[PDB]
Design a binder for this molecule. Structure first.
Ligand SMILES: NC(=O)c1ccc[n+]([C@@H]2O[C@H](COP(=O)([O-])OP(=O)(O)OC[C@H]3O[C@@H](n4cnc5c(N)ncnc54)[C@H](O)[C@@H]3O)[C@@H](O)[C@H]2O)c1
Ligand SMILES: NC(=O)c1ccc[n+]([C@@H]2O[C@H](COP(=O)([O-])OP(=O)(O)OC[C@H]3O[C@@H](n4cnc5c(N)ncnc54)[C@H](O)[C@@H]3O)[C@@H](O)[C@H]2O)c1
Ligand SMILES: OC[C@H]1O[C@H](O[C@H]2[C@H](O)[C@@H](O)[C@@H](O)O[C@@H]2CO)[C@H](O)[C@@H](O)[C@@H]1O
Ligand SMILES: OC[C@H]1O[C@H](O[C@H]2[C@H](O)[C@@H](O)[C@@H](O)O[C@@H]2CO)[C@H](O)[C@@H](O)[C@@H]1O
Lengths: 478, 476
């Protein structure tokens, strides 16, 4: 039979096309039916146009279905992948501005160890509620389907779903590929490196880093001593080897990986100039207003180009996606988009997203190593059983088999980084589940940016008064 | 039985143990060795102590020593009430912190506002706890180490994790329960209560009366009488707005010093302290309230020196008759009465050290609130973190109570865990000598504005003359 895979938030083109192309490149999953769902009809139609073109151009037999309805993407599904962001970037920025208006630089959701700009955990009640609503619908309509959480917040979200809805659920992220930048900068062969990461999503550490039967951190130490002085970031997100990362490594004893670097204490984020010092010129990292605008702009351009490409495919039914950049111009935006298209068109190249390989491991026993977000259940020492952690695991027809963490994470990481980060995840979930507004007020009473009780009352009142937050306000009413 | 007391110059503490020892028939015949480095305060307490013993006719031998080894050898119990550096060092360091923008000093942290409860700048104090403990292990391995000196939480956790001797911490904070009982008008013998947490971080997890939940009675009091509440002194904050507010969030009442140990919300500035802890002092941890307390300490020491002098000037006179020889001088007669008041207050002191010793040696069993390694008593806390919980003590030792109902999750997750993390920082800095731990505490402090501020406040504290070994310890 045809494996049914549903994608919520399918309008996110690059992601959907990566999943679609990976499926086409996976023998055991050929013939699958992909239901694409979104609330934005234009973005939805655009991805359907491009995905259908792709499948035909490459000779695949993948079938598609379109819907704007949650029930249709879930009914009969074997896997449900959620990449939706309720409220979009417009909601994120309106809230951030309200925060800054009341003295909270970068918004109230930016907290010690969670500076990632689109990783809201308190003001995005609607996003958290959608995760739960999807999970409950899966429980009711397709009880044996897997819920694959791709949207942020992955840590809070996956913990919330696994603790409250009895379905199979896992979160997936690309964060760990930061390991590959370190390996390449040290001139080491990836296949010769024995690595392991552990922590929570966007809060992971390189607990094991060996090369040729020995601890390889000395090689990183050599790189820091001899070459870090010449280090420069290529874009706002290129901070794996920034002063912030190195300094965290020096204190904790292991390297923070990926977005974990952005998720430092307030020390590296007191102001723009401080951000530039730790994350590099000219942006001050992805989470400054400069760096975040850089990001928002690239996203806008990607959506523009997708819409253009879709339009053109419909008007020029004979054009081939491989005739890319003959239709598209040559500005940075377009050239990058063509590189992406070429990678998805290459039959021997997988995208790197873990969703499809995960499905193939489970259904066809093509086992592989994954970095997954699952309930801890003792994997990481010192963390509660029901806290979702991000760790490596072998996955096969018999399911997810967590690796043993070794060497274990250093005590400093567990005691001084993960524990406070978990405490704020616990507050976010307790506020969400109980509707007790004093949990959110407590988070702000302890926030270093808070100067008075009036400030806390006002920022909360304004966020709860936004039109899209009517049910959130009622949920929090005493 | 030999009992050694380190820091015996701590007048109130010493005279209260003297008084209780005299009233404990089971410990008659005991030898008490008083030790301090301040010869003057030491002689005064020894002079008053022997004079009191004579008076009431108790059978106790009191001696003094300025030597740590002598107070420990042959001892069955070693009680530490000493504060290395004294209040002088405390204020010296606090002034430095404030110079660099840390109101009330860098040791004032979320959930640890108690002004004399230093945990990072008082390296010398922490090292003494360990030095005392190692000597006990060396010289009198079977002695019990009883810690009265602060910080009890960090200190007792430090000692129990590193030295294999019997150690327990004792405090009087839990008595806040009695104030609640009295204000609600309840018969004490009908109240079934329990507290649990860490030292100066305990909560009334159980509060029942005649078998039913008694919190509704506190709710009644809050709703009908709190608006008329006013504190009698800077420390009288058990039923303050701060306490009530913590109770409303956490679900259980914070007890004793726990009330002082709130988040920065109630301590942003003096006016905020007044709002939460009451007029006119703003609690014991404002500059006004703390000064009020410092004044009481100075007064007590002056009193004991004046009286010790009179005792020597009038060798044949009994303590209770000393006023009789000071003639028309009411001030001097009042000094003697002041001292007698310390020895025999109108209401019992409640100090647990003597009862504890009597419980262990003579099996005169009782309920105590002790600081001991957790070992699963409080769920969610590591086995080697020292907690403050109730226990039955008898000939067979300490018998911890089962905590029931358990502390609410909010208390464990949002109060104890962060508090414990800072205890872990304090201990790691002390044990490893890695100054980056102390810098990390300050990088996260809401009062910190820059790296240079952190470097300089730490450098100045490390450059004090009393801190040469501390500076050496944190080097490299
Ligand atoms: N931007 C990225 O490349 C990226 C990478 C990794 C993870 N994520 C996470 O994925 C989520 C979305 O990513 P984004 O930045 O492209 O945001 P986005 O606003 O573009 O959301 C993407 C898709 O979600 C759809 N959507 C919104 N509300 C929906 C609803 N109620 N039901 C179904 N679909 C809905 C949108 O219309 C859109 O097509 C966020 O939580 C984000 O943090 C994004
Ligand atoms: N557990 C409780 O119930 C409780 C109650 C009040 C105070 N305290 C604690 O008791 C300690 C002292 O209280 P205090 O206000 O009297 O302080 P203090 O400094 O005035 O007196 C303590 C005594 O320590 C002595 N001392 C200093 N260094 C010494 C050393 N190296 N060896 C021996 N003795 C030494 C002093 O000379 C002094 O007589 C502090 O840590 C304080 O926080 C605890
Ligand atoms: O905060 C935005 C987005 O950032 C991260 O993803 C980055 C990734 O780290 C970069 O290496 C590059 O691949 O672009 C990504 C965004 O396209 C977070 O991992 C992600 O969750 C977050 O939404
Ligand atoms: O911070 C000084 C001192 O305060 C507390 O002791 C109080 C006690 O709680 C009161 O009940 C009353 O007895 O006065 C004491 C001060 O004399 C702390 O409990 C103690 O540890 C601390 O040193």
């Amino acid at each position: 039979p045809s494996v049914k895979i549903g994608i919520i938030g399918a309008g996110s083109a690059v992601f959907s096309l990566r999943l679609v192309s990976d499926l086409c490149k996976t023998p055991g999953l050929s013939g699958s039916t992909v239901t694409l769902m979104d609330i934005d009809e234009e973005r939805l139609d655009a991805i359907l146009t491009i995905a259908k073109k792709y499948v035909e151009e490459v000779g695949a037999d993948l079938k598609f279905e379109k819907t704007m309805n949650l029930d249709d993407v879930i009914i009969d599904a074997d896997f449900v992948i959620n990449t939706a962001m309720v409220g979009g970037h417009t909601y994120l920025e309106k809230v951030r501005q309200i925060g800054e208006k009341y003295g909270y630089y970068r918004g109230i959701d930016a907290q010690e160890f969670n500076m990632v700009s689109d990783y809201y955990t308190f003001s995005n009640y609607n996003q958290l509620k959608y995760f739960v609503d999807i999970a409950r619908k899966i429980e009711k309509l397709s009880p044996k389907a897997w819920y694959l959480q791709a949207a942020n917040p992955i840590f809070e979200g996956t913990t919330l779903v696994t603790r409250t809805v009895p379905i199979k659920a896992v979160g997936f992220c690309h964060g760990h590929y930061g390991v590959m930048e370190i390996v390449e900068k040290l001139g080491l062969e990836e296949e010769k490196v024995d690595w392991q990461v552990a922590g929570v999503n966007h809060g992971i550490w390189l607990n094991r880093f060996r090369y040729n039967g020995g601890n390889a951190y000395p090689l990183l130490d050599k790189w820091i001593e001899e070459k870090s002085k010449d280090w420069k970031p290529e874009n706002p997100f290129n901070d794996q080897l920034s002063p912030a990362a190195i300094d965290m490594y020096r204190f904790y004893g292991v390297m923070p990986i990926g977005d974990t670097v952005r998720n430092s204490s307030w020390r590296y984020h007191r102001d723009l100039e401080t951000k530039k010092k730790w994350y590099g010129e000219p942006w001050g990292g992805a989470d400054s207003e400069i760096g975040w605008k850089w990001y928002q702009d690239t996203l806008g351009k990607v959506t523009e180009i997708t819409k253009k490409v879709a339009k053109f495919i419909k008007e020029n039914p004979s054009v081939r996606l491989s005739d890319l950049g003959s239709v598209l111009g040559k500005d940075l935006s377009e050239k990058q988009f063509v590189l992406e298209v070429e990678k998805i068109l290459d039959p021997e190249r997988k995208s790197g997203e873990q969703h499809i390989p995960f499905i193939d491991a489970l259904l066809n026993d093509n086992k592989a190593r994954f970095v997954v977000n699952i309930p801890n259940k003792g994997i990481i020492h010192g963390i509660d059983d029901d806290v979702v952690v991000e760790v490596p695991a072998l996955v096969d027809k018999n399911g997810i088999h967590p690796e043993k963490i070794e060497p274990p994470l250093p005590d400093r990481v567990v005691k001084y980084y993960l524990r406070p980060r978990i405490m704020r995840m616990e507050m976010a979930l307790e506020a969400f589940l109980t509707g007790d507004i004093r949990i959110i007020k407590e988070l702000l009473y302890r926030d270093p940016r808070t100067k008075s009780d009036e400030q806390v009352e006002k920022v909360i009142e304004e966020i709860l008064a936004l039109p899209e937050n009517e049910e959130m306000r009622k949920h929090y009413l005493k």
